[PDB]
């Protein structure tokens, strides 16, 4: 199977990349994820809010109330500076990792000679 | 920073890719990781054994005693069938994820028109 922790990591990554594209609210995020996935990934609100409560508590995203021109309150989320930085540190750390793995295949092969 | 959970995920991935290259023991694994990383990643044995105890408990790797031609016992580790499969499920799930993220950038851009 795919371990829960890995799923969670995936969902995190995706959701942060939606915010990267712009401040958004629950139903916008879900729709965007559904379209970009062909409906193969349909987030719940429960899930999205459980994740965001965690990201917000750790200061990676922040929330704010939208215009009430609509006449009803809507909560928006954005990536924070720390947010942006972690996404950057993460991305780079992973590309080093992918290099290390190239090098393992390389070194293996090279000693087949 | 890079969250501990992400570091752990990285170290897992790397270690499993070493076993992928062949059955190995602690000091072989460490050396191989150190060479493929330029010494930028020097695993402890403590760490390696804490991780492997977990992987082995979850049936992703298995261990066995090496030849005692050496005259001393050495423990080897190998990836299991389940091991190989999880590495495959994982890898594929991540490439879907990377696609989803392409599609988010794509969809964003496309509606700038």
Author numbering:
A (entry chain A), B (entry chain A): 3 to 115
Paper text:
In previous work, we have introduced pAF into lactococcal multidrug resistance regulator (LmrR), a small homodimeric protein harbouring a pore that exhibits promiscuous substrate binding capabilities, either by direct incorporation using the dedicated orthogonal translation system (OTS),19 or, preferably, by introduction of p-azidophenylalanine (pAzF), followed by a post-translational Staudinger reduction. Incorporation of aY into protein scaffold LmrR gave rise to an artificial Friedel–Crafts (FC) alkylase exhibiting complementary enantioselectivity to a previous FC-alkylase design using p-aminophenylalanine as catalytic residue in the same protein. X-ray crystal structures of the parent and evolved designer enzymes suggest that the introduced mutations cause a narrowing of the active site and a reorientation of the catalytic –NH2 group.
We used this improved OTS to incorporate aY via amber SCS at position V15 in the LmrR protein. Remarkably, while V15aY exhibits the characteristic LmrR structure, forming an open pore at its dimeric interface of similar shape and dimensions as observed in other LmrR structures, the V15aY_RNYW_KK structure appears to be more closed and exhibits a narrowed cavity. Furthermore, a significant difference in the rotameric state of the aY side chain is observed (S11†). Strikingly, the opposite enantiomer of product 3a was obtained when compared to LmrR_V15pAF (further referred to as V15pAF), albeit with low yield (entries 2 and 3). The results showed that directed evolution led to a 3.4-fold increase in apparent catalytic efficiency, with (kcat/KM-2a)app values of 3.3 M−1 s−1 and 11.2 M−1 s−1 for V15aY and V15aY_RNYW, respectively.
